[PDB]
């Protein structure tokens, strides 16, 4: 296909591709974080078992929803969503966290991971605002407000 000044949804192509690149790095972080959270669910031991087995599942279920919506936003911008483990490991800032078996280590892992997601989502929000990409802005807004609330709760548990 020939390059076009505007994409199918009527946004500037260059600016949309920059946004999609940043969204793809975000998606990489989500994917590694989701995997870590699945591990937290599986591997928890001790008297927090039932509570946190269930909490971690709630948390990764909500991440999975976001992963779906994020890949769709990338497609919506006429860009390619990263869709391999190898690709995600190359791009992610969040590290693989394995053999976390205690509530506090897993919960702190979540806090630290969400702190990266929030930071990256605020940067994307700002960039999207600069060019009037309201669809991308709106998505980041939703993610930020939800995850700020969650970060409050996780930190409350850890006090």
Residue ranges that bind its own copies, judged by CB under 8 A: 8-10, 31-32, 35, 38-39, 42-51, 53, 55, 71-73, 75-76, 78, 80-81, 83-89, 96, 98-99, 103, 115, 118-119, 122, 125-126, 132, 134-135, 137-142, 144-145, 148-149, 151-153, 155-157, 159
Burial class from Cβ neighbours inside 10 Å (0-12, 13-18, 19+) for residue 81 reads middle
Residues forming the site for Cl ion (CB under 5 A): 82-84, 87
| 22 and 123 Cβ atoms separated by less than 8 Å | yes
Closest Cα to residue 69, out of 34, 37, 23?
23
Phi, psi at residue 100, to the nearest 5°? -90, 110
Give the shortest CB-18-to-Cl ion separation in angstroms: 18
Give the shortest CB-33-to-its own copies separation in angstroms: 11
Query: Residue 146: how many CB atoms within 10 A of its CB?
Result: 12
Q: Which is nearer to Cl ion, 68 or 126 (CB)?
A: 68
């Amino acid at each position: 296909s020939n390059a076009m000044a505007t994409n199918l949804i009527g946004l500037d192509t260059t600016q949309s591709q920059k946004l999609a690149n940043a969204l793809n790095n975000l998606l990489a972080n989500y994917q590694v974080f989701y995997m870590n959270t699945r591990g937290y669910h599986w591997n928890i031991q001790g008297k927090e078992f039932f509570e946190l087995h269930a909490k971690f599942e709630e948390i990764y279920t909500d991440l999975q929803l976001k992963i779906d919506e994020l890949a769709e936003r990338i497609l919506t911008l006429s860009a390619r969503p990263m869709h391999s483990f190898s690709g995600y490991l190359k791009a992610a800032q969040i590290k693989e966290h394995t053999d976390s078996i205690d509530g506090r280590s897993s919960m702190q892992g979540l806090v630290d991971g969400f702190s990266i997601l929030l930071h990256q989502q605020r940067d994307i929000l700002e960039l999207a605002g600069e060019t009037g990409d309201e669809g991308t802005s709106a998505l980041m807004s939703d993610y930020i407000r939800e995850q700020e609330k969650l970060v409050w709760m996780l930190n409350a548990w850890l006090k």
